[PDB]
Amino acid sequence: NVTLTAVKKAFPDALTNAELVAMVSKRLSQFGYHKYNTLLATSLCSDEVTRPLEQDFGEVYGKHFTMGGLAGFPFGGLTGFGAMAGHIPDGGSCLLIYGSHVGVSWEGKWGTVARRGREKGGACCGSAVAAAQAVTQAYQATDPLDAQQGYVRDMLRPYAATLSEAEDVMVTLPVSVYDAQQKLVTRILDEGSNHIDGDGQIAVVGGIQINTPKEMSDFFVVRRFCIRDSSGNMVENFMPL
Template identity: 45%
Template structure:
């Protein structure tokens, strides 16, 4: 049921291993070498999201993590600069980013079967909470203020960003499908701002961005990734190659 639902709800989604293979092949054609490429990811901290990272690190070794709740690159410009300074001499970087959503064994979008639990549960929990916040504000509730400390600051930002798409979510045919797509649009904007602010830190190295929606499935079934962006940028932040067709 899960894989059938992935195919209908997220057409074009690829299995994690297939995505990693296609990325590697496309980047090799663009002048990337495995041994001089550093991988950075901005994926949600939820433990179900590690499969794609493992597929990528099997090809490019260690992973630099930029992500927080819902996959937002909360580590920001500072983390990009740090990652850029870790690029092997003469090499380049690959950044994979995006929100995630579960599809459980019954084909329910927005839930996932977790290890050791009898029933499926919310996935992504942060996104679900943010969608609930957006619904309340659209119904007339006051917007939440930002916290004075960092104890739950990330969730406040997830809700604030998703609220920009309140009307879109109200009009959605399937809210559980639309939420991660809206969150991707938020994160894509943020990631491009980060790159624009810090691209020169690569000192000539190219920046490959692969953005989309990660789709978590039950044990025994591959996770999927719906690619929305695959582009290479130069050290000035200009797009020099659009490779999205290679992920078809």
């Protein structure tokens, strides 16, 4: 269909949720990640359409720790990571799944997707799109109440030039949000490596979550898939797929 063709034109390497979970769990099983000894953590957007990915991994690794917030940034931060690390089964490891997301419609249009019970779905990712509008308009001019969305604007500001010049800003936006996210994730992992001990590891899957209409499988574009030791050193890199 139009939607699937659109998805694979923008991201030829995109996997279905089912393909992703099968691939990740199979690979990690060879490195001793099983259900009993793995704590799943996610950093995905607040938006309810991102839940299926959490459910799909949760079927394999159980109830997850949530690090995310608006646009999928790991707002739980250093304290959240340390808390999570203190929950890892003894002698076990963590698996962190993070990413931006974007909707694609029945017409193959990016930045929006039909939502249950609504005639108009609005923006997807709403947070990222609003932040994009704010930073690009500021550019083209060449308190916890709302603090998170403030941070999203802050982290997207370096991409303002990139966004304004983009052929399709709605495909470029989630790529930019992912790049901003992966930098923050790296920093948290570097700062929090003290919380992982001995042969404990952290496996990381990062990329772009693609939300399609409910009658269709969602997709995920993997950009990072690797394993880090307790010292913070990369031990395995599974990219490219």
